[PDB]
Design a protein around this ligand. Structure first.
Ligand code: LGD
Length: 250
């Protein structure tokens, strides 16, 4: 049968994205966070094109398309960055970008040290669970359909069907080369727990950058337009509880 679904996921996978950070400059909260925000803007562009090229994404209402990308953005970045850290530096550092790698010191200067530690943990899971490139790609796609308005999307049913379909693709990736339903069910438990763990992290990052945005002038950290827009328009909906993650587990 079909390697079509995976042919597609691999084909649309975004390439390397640099932050434009000059590493000869002193590690300061301002410089680091300003580079992160700029990296954010560049990655969003890629994320949008990627999401819109996913199988069945367009059979979602046009207004819903942009909203789910915007709500799930942070989590997508968390997850992919963790995978990058794993594949490039075996999870010992946060590999945001080739030119923006966080070591211990930068984690502290970022003023988000504990969160960075939680992200390294997440990254380490890819190794401890021997997550495959295929598992990674299907799980990343699933994250795009993991956070929505409590009182529904414009056409919630089209979303529901798509999400259900991405879960079924995850199901068969797990069943491929697998044998008995018990082996499958345990991997599924592991992978859904991993997906869920992205949400608490993304939420802290939401809180952190929202606060930073409000704070920006007095702290000398600047935000590009698209970031400032999503942070002040979409993020507050999550922080105010109108938009929530779809946890598998309680
Ligand atoms: O690959 C990445 C991964 C992250 C991860 F922290 F969410 F994992 C990331 C975060 C931010 N931001 C958040 C913050 F608050 F942590 F610094 C800033 C912003 F402005 F985009 F939201 C910008 C680019 C990336 N790029």
């Amino acid at each position: 049968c079909q390697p079509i679904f995976l042919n597609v996921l691999e084909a649309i996978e975004p390439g390397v994205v640099c932050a434009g950070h000059d590493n000869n400059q002193p590690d300061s909260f301002a410089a680091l966070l300003s580079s992160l925000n700029e990296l954010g803007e560049r990655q969003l562009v890629h994320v949008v094109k990627w999401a819109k090229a996913l199988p069945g994404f367009r059979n979602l209402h046009v207004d819903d398309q942009m909203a789910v990308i915007q709500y799930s953005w942070m989590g997508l970045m968390v997850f992919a960055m963790g995978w990058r850290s794993f594949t490039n530096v075996n999870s010992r550092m946060l590999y945001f970008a080739p030119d923006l790698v966080f070591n211990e010191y930068r984690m502290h200067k970022s003023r988000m040290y504990s969160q960075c530690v939680r992200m390294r943990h997440l990254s380490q899971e890819f190794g401890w669970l021997q997550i495959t490139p295929q598992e990674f790609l299907c799980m990343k796609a699933l994250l795009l359909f993991s956070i929505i308005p409590v009182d529904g999307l414009k056409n919630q049913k089209f979303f529901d069907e798509l999400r259900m379909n991405y879960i079924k693709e995850l199901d068969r990736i797990i069943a491929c080369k697998r044998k008995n339903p018990t082996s499958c069910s345990r991997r599924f438990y592991q992978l859904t727990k991993l997906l869920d763990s992205v949400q608490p992290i993304a939420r802290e990052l939401h809180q952190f950058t929202f606060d930073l945005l409000i704070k920006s002038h007095m702290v000398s950290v600047d935000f590009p337009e698209m970031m400032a827009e999503i942070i002040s328009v979409q993020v507050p909906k999550i922080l105010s509880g109108k938009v929530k993650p779809i946890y598998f587990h309680t």
